[PDB]
Design a protein around this ligand. Structure first.
Ligand SMILES: Cc1cc2nc3c(=O)[nH]c(=O)nc-3n(C[C@H](O)[C@H](O)[C@H](O)COP(=O)(O)OP(=O)(O)OC[C@H]3O[C@@H](n4cnc5c(N)ncnc54)[C@H](O)[C@@H]3O)c2cc1C
Ligand SMILES: Cc1cc2c(c(C)c1Cl)N(CC(=O)O)C(=O)CO2
Ligand SMILES: [Cl-]
Length: 442
């Protein structure tokens, strides 16, 4: 059985390995050059959690990826003047996540696909698809075009997928775009600076500031990659529109992030040389065209990054697609069932990612008592009352079920605290009863 995959990023390389391993004839096309060919040219990080780690585990690559990953035990919150505060992510060191360099991951996955027998072809970008004739057109940076025949086409070509554009002209995909008002910019902290300011290596760092914020993830050599999230446009308010050059960015950091600015030795140059990125949420009602083509990963469901689950979801998609294709009656059956299974879960993580943004800078007295009570209920009923962050991050429960269980827990906590000043007035034994009455064990 034959397949053509567009995009050798994270989902495309993983599905290529899983199908080649099963004896499929796989051809993978990528517009960038091969990153494994060392050049004289001169650092993006991601958070790997259980969903992505489990996908790599099935592919037999987890140990190689984790050997180059830095453990993050929790969230380190910075407010000027005050000492940083560590919020642990899990119950113990079994529940942690991992900072992995994006380029390192992609190189490991590329080697793994070739080892399984897939053929990879770089410097070729997909331009268009002719579905009636089963041919597609690719081009190099020098504009020269060539044509190829295909039997099955997998769009793994990212948030700006050309496969999706071609599909949307022969079927109605129910596309809807929800634009995000924030852009982002990447900046660097050196190993020297991070040591000098005693920045904890085994944590994710965040500088909240309401409508804008900064995060930082660690690297193996003790450097950190910093990401600024800030509105493109002002309604007045700060925004990328007012930051005309690196010197303006420096003044903004010294005023709004005064304890982070001294760590950013190359702020001015990074700001002017790295491009400002865009964010969005894009939802589709269907991900396939008959038995001829299918989408996965960011090509199917771009999401805002505030839960750190886009790569984790894409790798989970790749496992599912390979399973459906291996055992279905025919490609058309496989693609319809893949869409039916994954699209409701992709929709749910898209919604939870947006909610995490508000959840994190955007403080309440009710919220405090609710969280005090939820910890008690998780200690008394560890099998039933499980924080939604844990369900999303450390389990493989379908996203839609994680969201539903999270909703029941929030309603129980709301009614339990309503019109109570503090825990002294609440009948904990009675709350525990409702927990058992409404939440089945897992
Ligand atoms: C700022 C930021 C932070 C994030 N942090 C996290 C995090 O902590 N954890 C997490 O899990 N996710 C995170 N994500 C999301 C994650 O990066 C993506 O969801 C993930 O990379 C999607 O993988 P993919 O294989 O579907 O797409 P990609 O990784 O983008 O791969 C697409 C590939 O297709 C190629 N391509 C594109 N167009 C064509 C074409 N026409 N022809 C041929 N090839 C083409 C591209 O060059 C690329 O190689 C973050 C995203 C952003 C923007
Ligand atoms: C880009 C990014 C990646 C993430 C997280 C966040 C905020 C961001 Cl902005 N988080 C969420 C959290 O701490 O609630 C994680 O867990 C780890 O992946
Ligand atoms: Cl993400």
């Amino acid at each position: 059985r034959q397949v053509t995959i567009i995009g050798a990023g994270l989902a495309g390389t993983l599905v290529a390995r899983l199908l080649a391993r099963n004896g499929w004839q796989v051809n993978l096309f990528e517009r960038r050059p091969d990153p494994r060919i060392e050049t004289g040219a001169r650092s993006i990080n991601l958070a790997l959690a259980e969903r992505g780690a489990h996908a790599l585990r099935l592919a037999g690559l987890e140990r190689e990826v984790l050997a180059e990953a830095v453990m993050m035990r929790g969230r380190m919150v910075h407010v000027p003047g005050t000492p940083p505060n560590l919020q642990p992510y899990g119950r113990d060191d079994s529940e942690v996540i991992w900072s992995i360099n994006r380029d390192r991951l992609n190189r490991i996955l590329l080697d793994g696909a070739e080892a399984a027998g897939a053929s990879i072809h770089f410097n070729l970008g997909l331009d268009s698809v002719d579905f009636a004739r089963q041919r597609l057109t690719l081009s190099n940076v020098s504009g020269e075009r060539l044509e190829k025949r295909f039997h099955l086409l997998i769009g793994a070509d990212g948030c700006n997928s050309a496969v999706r554009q071609a599909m949307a002209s022969v079927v109605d995909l129910g596309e809807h775009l929800e634009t995000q008002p924030h852009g982002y910019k990447e900046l660097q902290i050196t190993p020297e600076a991070s040591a000098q300011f005693n920045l904890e290596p085994n944590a994710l760092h965040i500088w909240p500031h309401g409508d804008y914020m900064c995060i930082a993830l660690p690297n193996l050599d003790r450097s950190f990659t910093v990401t600024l999230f800030l509105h493109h446009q002002s309604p007045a308010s700060p925004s990328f529109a007012q930051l005309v050059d690196g010197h303006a960015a420096r003044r903004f950091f010294q005023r709004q992030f005064p304890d982070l600015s001294p760590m950013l030795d190359s702020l001015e140059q990074d700001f002017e040389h790295h491009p400002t990125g865009k964010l969005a949420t894009l939802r589709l009602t269907t991900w396939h065209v008959g038995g001829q083509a299918v989408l996965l990963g960011d090509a199917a469901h771009p999401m805002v990054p505030f839960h750190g689950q886009g790569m984790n979801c894409a790798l989970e998609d790749a496992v599912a697609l390979a399973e459906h294709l291996q055992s279905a009656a025919d490609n058309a059956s496989a693609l319809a069932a893949f869409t039916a299974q994954r699209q409701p879960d992709a929709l749910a993580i898209q919604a939870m990612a947006l909610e995490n943004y508000v959840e994190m800078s955007s403080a309440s007295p009710t919220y405090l008592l609710e969280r005090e009570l939820g910890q008690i209920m998780a200690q008394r009923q560890p099998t039933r009352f499980i924080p939604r962050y844990s369900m999303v991050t450390f389990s493989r429960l379908p996203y839609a079920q994680a969201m539903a269980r999270g909703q029941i827990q929030e309603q129980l906590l709301k009614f339990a605290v309503a019109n109570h000043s503090d825990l002294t007035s609440i009948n904990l034994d009675a709350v525990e009863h409702e927990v058992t009455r409404c939440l089945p064990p897992l």
